[PDB]
């Protein structure tokens, strides 16, 4: 049949240039590959092209030397339309459940293939969207199975760039939906950015943000450097796994995972990424270890790079320093509050172990996903908006749900923990609830 | 020549029952070995024996079953007198530097042996006192040097129970002062309390606190249950190591260490701990659940919370627990942020928290450490005994040639606006 594709950047701000770069680069591969713009629905906040801090206005890149990937990207769903509702609508094929954006869904037929590339971000069982709410794993998987029952695709491939991305699929993703998934990381470790200001694969001087992500950059460079009619899904995965682990040193890399129907791994790659005619006569099938940045560190390293640039504007400089100390104060409040809530619910001898214990690979994060969202609303109402950072704390919330704590107990613990602290503008009654 | 001793508990409150009990116990032993009351100086706040929460008023135990250790322990230095300046005066034998207390000191002679035991907690290069200021490794070592320059003894043994007690001697203890030292832990791990409410060798059901400390209770139990006229210093060390290590020494026990002149190891323990004459028909040879010292005070506050399941006072326990944690997060939080304003988010952590290799001093400039602690406390609040854990952070800020000026700038932005209530050095006194 025909190839459709969803591309999603779950991020915002020039700090997260790489996620919007990633989905922009992705669009171009599928264009060069004979996937038609008709059938590509690009989500992206779209605040990078004309960011005051973009030294090339109108131009996004995804390689230190790479060309523009912006020129041609449809503004399908930008700004506050980058929502889990619109994603689930766009995926299913239902324009009568989309709010805003350019009406484009995946109205696909049983003989078609869909490719999904996510990039930003993530925590345990949660994926970033620029604005609350976030994506929760069971919600995502539930859409996928709903789509299978509609007989809306033949086979699907999903690539998730995000921190602890494994946690979206482990113990909840069936292998009978004709869907195959790869994730930048397992369900308990950081993903990374490359092409970062002062790093071994160096970007241009003018660039103070990471241009791409180790995982994302790894598969897109792979697909554009090979005959996709010749190479298999499986060959790609095993090339992306090596590059993303930096030769199995996991201090500076992550474990690229496989989930769903592993039969899809025998298929030629062009069924999903199309065929670039230029790629005929390319090597069918050993690279230097790329210097990287912890995705959770990046957005703070960026604020610091500006602080050191902005020396000779003590007016503007001290606005950065203010923004930094505000961010870290909220980072520290959130971390500290979770900890105390643990102490109040389980006592201070066993609270850490209960909050931060990771289940065995293949068991799901939570057992009741309704409770997870419930606990998260309670937390935010009393303690403040998680922000994207607070996604790290989902295991905590999930592990509360797993310990069978009553909503009331979680209410008092939060009320006790936070009732006395002033979050400022960062409250769910301004920024909306994460769940 | 006569034997002398100095026993110091560095902590306060019913929560730290272990430490005043460790030293009381120690005194009773030393007396039992014929060391006189007039030769032993005792530092204890003295807030345990007649404490509301004591199920046995006027009594103190350092064992689930074992007897009163409080009976007749001298009240040489108690309350606000348990000060670094009194500790140094006493050890030096200097009556003119002593403020308050009995005015008992160690005026030992060139042929006299001395035993120093301390219990509470600590952090990198700092030992606790019930009130600020605390004890800094260099000032302690300095005093030990000075005492030896005046030949106020033949040989000296020093036992130190405290978190990261290795940091007090590593890099700054000479081996040529005729002083042997064991610590309860290396320079970067935690020491433990034992005989605790829930734990495996249980205390009396009546007690809501730990009764002793593993290393303290190990050496003292070893000494009172062995003919010390046969047992070596070295032999006790090994016995205390193996038990203090417990099952796992990295995280469940700790690494009992040795510093200074290791010839004292050869000698018979009776030279320092005396000879218990009811241990002649006593042989020369011979796992238990424990609480990390840093967390004992919350296990105590909780164990109290679960003994009110009795309202009105129950809510006041949770009022304290949260106020305690709230401030413990402020400090942890403040330290991180100061490191991000000095070094940026890339370095900050690696710089603050990096542990030098053994036999290296914690800090090169101690007067700098002292200053940075004061800058912090002025802007951010009293470290309290908890905040001693941040001493390597401050040590690491000094070691990176940072200015008082920039440290003052970082703290001001870090803590500007934060309301520590009455936990400011203007109320509590500066920790240094």
UniProtKB/Swiss-Prot annotation, chain B:
Disulfide feature: 196-210, 368-398, 380-415
InterPro entries for this protein: AE, Legum_prodom, Legumain_prodom_sf, Peptidase_C13
This protein's UniProt keywords: Disulfide bond, Glycoprotein, Hydrolase, Protease, Signal, Thiol protease, Zymogen
Main EC class the enzyme belongs to: hydrolase
GO molecular function, one term: cysteine-type endopeptidase activity
Domain of life according to the entry: Eukaryota
UniProt-annotated catalytic positions: 121, 163
Presence of keyword Protease: yes
Reactions catalysed: Hydrolysis of proteins and small molecule substrates at -Asn-|-Xaa- bonds
Glycosylation sites: 263
Record-level GO BP terms: proteolysis involved in protein catabolic process; vacuolar protein processing
Site (Required for post-translational maturation and enzyme activity): 210
UniProt EC number: 3.4.22.34
GO CC terms in record: vacuole
pH dependence: Optimum pH is 5.0-6.5.
Regulation: Repressed by various protease inhibitors including p-chloromercuribenzene sulfonic acid (PCMBS), N-ethylmaleimide, kininogen, elastatinal, cystatin EW and leupeptin.
UniProt cross-references to PANTHER family, sorted A to Z: HEMOGLOBINASE FAMILY MEMBER, LEGUMAIN
Function: Asparaginyl endopeptidase able to cleave almost all peptide bonds on the carboxyl side of Asn residues, except at the NH2 terminus or second position or with N-glycosylated Asn. Responsible for the maturation (circular permutation) of concanavalin A from its precursor, by performing both cleavage and cleavage-coupled transpeptidation to form conA.
Family statement: Belongs to the peptidase C13 family.
Subunit structure and binding partners: Homodimer.
Name of protein: Legumain
């Amino acid at each position: 049949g025909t190839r459709w594709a969803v591309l999603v950047a779950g991020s915002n701000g020039y700090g997260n240039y790489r996620h919007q770069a990633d989905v922009c680069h992705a669009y171009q591969l599928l264009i060069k590959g004979g996937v038609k713009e008709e059938n590509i629905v690009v989500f992206m906040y779209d605040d990078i092209a004309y960011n005051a801090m973009n030294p090339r206005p109108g131009v996004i890149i995804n390689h230190p030397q790479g060309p523009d990937v912006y020129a041609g990207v449809p503004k399908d769903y930008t700004g506050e339309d980058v929502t889990p509702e619109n994603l689930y609508a766009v995926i299913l094929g239902d324009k009568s459940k989309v709010k805003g954006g350019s009406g484009k869904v995946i109205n696909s037929n049983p003989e078609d293939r869909i490719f999904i590339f996510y990039s930003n971000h993530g925590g345990p069982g949660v994926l970033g969207m620029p604005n609350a709410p976030f994506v929760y794993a069971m919600d995502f998987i539930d859409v996928l199975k709903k789509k299978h029952a509609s007989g809306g695709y033949k086979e699907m491939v999903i690539y998730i760039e995000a921190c602890e991305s494994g946690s979206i699929f482990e113990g909840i993703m069936p292998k009978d939906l004709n869907i195959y998934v790869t994730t930048a990381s397992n369900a308990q470790e950081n993903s990374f950015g490359t092409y970062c200001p002062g790093m071994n694969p160096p970007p241009p001087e003018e660039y103070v943000t990471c241009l791409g992500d180790l995982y994302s950059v790894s598969w897109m460079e792979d697909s554009e450097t090979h005959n996709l009619k010749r190479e298999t899904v499986q060959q790609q995965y095993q090339s992306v796994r090596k590059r993303t682990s930096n030769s199995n040193s996991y201090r500076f890399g992550s474990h690229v995972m496989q989930y769903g129907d592993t039969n899809i791994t025998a298929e030629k790659l062009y069924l999903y990424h199309g065929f670039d005619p230029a790629t005929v006569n390319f090597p069918p099938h050993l690279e230097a270890k790329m210097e990287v940045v912890n995705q959770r560190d990046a957005e703070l390293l960026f604020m610091w790079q500006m602080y050191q640039r902005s020396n000779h504007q003590p007016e503007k400089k001290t606005h950065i320093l203010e923004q930094i100390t505000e961010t870290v104060k909220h980072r520290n409040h959130l971390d500290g509050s979770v900890e105390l809530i643990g102490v109040l619910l389980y006592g201070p001898g066993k609270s850490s172990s209960v909050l931060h214990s990771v289940r065995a690979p293949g068991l799901p994060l939570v057992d009741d996903w309704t409770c997870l969202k419930s606990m998260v609303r309670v937390f935010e109402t009393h303690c403040g908006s998680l922000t994207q950072y607070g996604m790290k704390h989902m295991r905590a919330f999930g592990n509360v749900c797993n310990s069978g704590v009553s909503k009331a107990s979680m209410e008092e613990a939060c009320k006790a923990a936070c009732g006395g602290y002033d979050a400022g503008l960062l409250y769910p009654s301004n920024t909306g609830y994460s769940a």
